[PDB]
Amino acid sequence: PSQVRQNYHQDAEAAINRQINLELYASYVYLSMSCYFDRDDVALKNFAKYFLHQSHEEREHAEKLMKLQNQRGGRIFLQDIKKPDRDDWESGLNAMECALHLEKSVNQSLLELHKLATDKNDPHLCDFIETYYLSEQVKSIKELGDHVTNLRKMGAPEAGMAEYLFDKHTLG
Amino acid sequence: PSQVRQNYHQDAEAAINRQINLELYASYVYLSMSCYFDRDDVALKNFAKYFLHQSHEEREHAEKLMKLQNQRGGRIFLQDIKKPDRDDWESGLNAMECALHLEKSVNQSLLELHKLATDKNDPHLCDFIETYYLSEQVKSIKELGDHVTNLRKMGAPEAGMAEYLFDKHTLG
Amino acid sequence: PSQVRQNYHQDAEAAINRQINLELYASYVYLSMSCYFDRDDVALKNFAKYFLHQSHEEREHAEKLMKLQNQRGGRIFLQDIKKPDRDDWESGLNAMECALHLEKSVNQSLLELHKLATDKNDPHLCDFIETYYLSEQVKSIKELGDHVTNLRKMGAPEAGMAEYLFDKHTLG
Amino acid sequence: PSQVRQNYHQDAEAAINRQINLELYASYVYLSMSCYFDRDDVALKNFAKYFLHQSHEEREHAEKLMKLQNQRGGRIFLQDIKKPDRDDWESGLNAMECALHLEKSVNQSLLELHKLATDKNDPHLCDFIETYYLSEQVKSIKELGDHVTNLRKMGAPEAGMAEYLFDKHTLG
Amino acid sequence: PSQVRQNYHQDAEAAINRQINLELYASYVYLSMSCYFDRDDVALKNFAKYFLHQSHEEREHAEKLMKLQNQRGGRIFLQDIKKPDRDDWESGLNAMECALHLEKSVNQSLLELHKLATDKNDPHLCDFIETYYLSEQVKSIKELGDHVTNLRKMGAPEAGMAEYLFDKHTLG
Amino acid sequence: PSQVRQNYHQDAEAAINRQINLELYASYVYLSMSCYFDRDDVALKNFAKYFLHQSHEEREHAEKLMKLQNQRGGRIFLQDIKKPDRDDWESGLNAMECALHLEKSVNQSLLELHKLATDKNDPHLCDFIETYYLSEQVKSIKELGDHVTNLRKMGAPEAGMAEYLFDKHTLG
Numbered sequence A, B, C, D, E, F: 001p002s003q004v005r006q007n008y009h010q011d012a013e014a015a016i017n018r019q020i021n022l023e024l025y026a027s028y029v030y031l032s033m034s035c036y037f038d039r040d041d042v043a044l045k046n047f048a049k050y051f052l053h054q055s056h057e058e059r060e061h062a063e064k065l066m067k068l069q070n071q072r073g074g075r076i077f078l079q080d081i082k083k084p085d086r087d088d089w090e091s092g093l094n095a096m097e098c099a100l101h102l103e104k105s106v107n108q109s110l111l112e113l114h115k116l117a118t119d120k121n122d123p124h125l126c127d128f129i130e131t132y133y134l135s136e137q138v139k140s141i142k143e144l145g146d147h148v149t150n151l152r153k154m155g156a157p158e159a160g161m162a163e164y165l166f167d168k169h170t171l172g
């Protein structure tokens, strides 16, 4: 056992490693979205900027989970980062909806991780999750829902000016 | 065909996708090294800082390659980022030697990519590789070789103060 | 022979003169586009500003080729700058598509010139082209492709607000 | 008819297009002279700087005429820019004398253009010419005559230090 | 083999060592020229300043080639720096012409070195040469050709005021 | 005889030429040492920095001796700069000991030169040597002796951390 390990369950360590992988996967998916929006035939530069920022934030979340794992005496075990479900995100609205789905799944993972930490009476893990991940996930989900709502209202994807003006105004 | 595609061969596109994957893998391996050095039983904070910086630089290299793919009209196809070869890097000297090996493999990949771009008479791809990746890889390999040499001379791994003082002086 | 002439083939000199003429022609075409967009019945001031900037950049590129010709001991031979293929560019989308075509032709000429310089084993000419012209041409082609894509999606030319809003947001 | 056009005769529009071409040609001739003086076997850097400045001024004059054409509702019709009368300008004195001849021909063109605008009772065109082109051409012709006089007195072209010292002193 | 050595041929290493010696020799020749022009019986202070600057630049070029040799894992082997072909450079024009010849020989050496690096498919060596040495050599050769041309026209060496005024104006 | 020559014996001129050559040789040897310490398998960056500084100081000494030669009306005669005694300096301690030996030999040459200048009753040459070279040589020899003493005490070369820590602390 690590000399710093205290009130850290093996299940908590495994769940934290799984969350690390899921946050790295979310970063990779956001990177894919950014790449798609940097294409010449998509050409939505603020969409690409937004999703690159999301990718970097998800990488920061994974690194924070790594720091937590190390601070608690748990051992980080990295896995293959699976490729995103697709490379063609097909629209700004569709990419925003997929980002909403991704952040909802990340939130669900964080929620079951918090449930696990509460089962093991690991108050530091619970506080870490609810302080650094749950509030940020709620904010991200709300922002993505706002983006999806505004894009749907403007008429995206059918309204070709909707995605462009959302790119200029909301994402610029 | 992309409207911007011109003098960009399918083989070059595939090679750049493979290079993007390899740069992402190198970033992941550097992240693993940083995680290992952030452990309480390793506790080399400047080693972890160094390898986190390397991970971020490799991620930036992958992002630049994807920007290149989009600029040339090629389509980025992301793959699974494979798990690093191991999670326990066993020493500062061993981690630096593995980083040397990784950067030499990345350099070899970039070199065969440049060879391919020269075969296809793609001067822009060749210049991009040369100005952004080959010089950087040579600098990284030379720096890692210096690190390995200094750690070996100091007595690492067996000299327990060698890695600590390398951490404080070279990496501080 | 010029006292500075060294490893500079006559064919390289002729190709550089032809590139000078082509870049002067591109400057002239961009000037025509700017003039068209300054018309009262077109009245797209950021389109005119964009194409005037492009004409000035192409003139700078021609002057850089002139400086290269003189630096290598080659003699600059200027030719008639042919008038642009049209004076009425009939839309912002059409002008951007024609600018894309023009920059792709300029890139093709630069690629042929680089191929020639590689055949004559003129490394300085190759480095000059790939350092000052190939990357800039790739960037210009990618930017023009983005412009064309955004204008097409917005609904240009038929969507009369598409060109106006692109003028205001992308080009402003 | 253009919605802004009024008191703008077709002959005035044609004369303005001809002046556009003539000023573009003057810019091209100044470019040729600058190129000649940037040669290694001429090596007169302030002569080249002076004639590049003249080329840019003539380009600005052509663009101002373009702006005038558009402001008046006339349509700019661009023509082939004929190559300069020669590529070897044979001396600093000879290039200065040819620049004098060129600016005097440009002024003569502007004078017959002003005569035409006066015959057609186009006071705005007359004012435009006289405030932006006639005084500028008189100043340019006087400066070129001063340059020619000083170079002739110094002993150019035969006095090889005359052009060098004029380059350093008058043009530096 | 060096731990950093990768895609670095023995012939490339030998050619780099020869170029190091050639750049040190060029620095030594420029030092000789500076010494000659600092003499009381020639006493051209800006000529001496110019050639001392050239000597220091050639020394910096040799040091950069040394850094390249070490970065690539090649071993620097220094040779005797041969004395300059003569100690009396006989005039400002003669020294400028000899400097032109020296820089053209250095350029030819760099060109055959680039040919060698291209034969061995060493893209990093080719890029290093073309970005740090070929453009600088072309600029130096053009500048020296300009100097020789201006000195020849001014009347050097026979015109004793020519070298003095070139010293004051071009070199001051 | 130079118009400036006065109380400057031919033997003093020859001795100063020999001293210029010896200072250039010392600069070359220091450059070799710096190159050795910039190698990946040596990787002592402050040792390389120190010896590069020493080579630049020795080059300044040679340049100042040549300025002295020219001020006195003597003619500088440059010779081949002999290759350094070896390319592999095999340790920081060994390189510092060889630098001590080199500076002691340079000091002995300067002392012989001062003895010669005293024999010829050349007070300006004696003052020049003792003002710019003897004090500097004594300081350099004392500093090199301190470096050698500290390296021997620390346990260099066998103590592999001795050279590293001397690099970081004394030379950093």
Ligand SMILES: [Fe+3]
Residues within 6 Å of the ligand: A165, C165
């Ligand atoms: Fe709007």
Ligand SMILES: [Fe+3]
Residues within 6 Å of the ligand: D165, E165
């Ligand atoms: Fe003067």
Ligand SMILES: [Zn+2]
Residues within 6 Å of the ligand: A023, A026, A057, A058, A061, A062, A106
């Ligand atoms: Zn997250």
Ligand SMILES: [Zn+2]
Residues within 6 Å of the ligand: B023, B026, B057, B058, B061, B106
């Ligand atoms: Zn990389």
Ligand SMILES: [Zn+2]
Residues within 6 Å of the ligand: C023, C026, C057, C058, C061, C062, C106
């Ligand atoms: Zn261009």
Ligand SMILES: [Zn+2]
Residues within 6 Å of the ligand: D023, D026, D057, D058, D061, D062, D106
């Ligand atoms: Zn004009």
Ligand SMILES: [Zn+2]
Residues within 6 Å of the ligand: E023, E026, E057, E058, E061, E062, E106
């Ligand atoms: Zn050089």
Ligand SMILES: [Zn+2]
Residues within 6 Å of the ligand: F023, F026, F057, F058, F061, F106
């Ligand atoms: Zn010295």
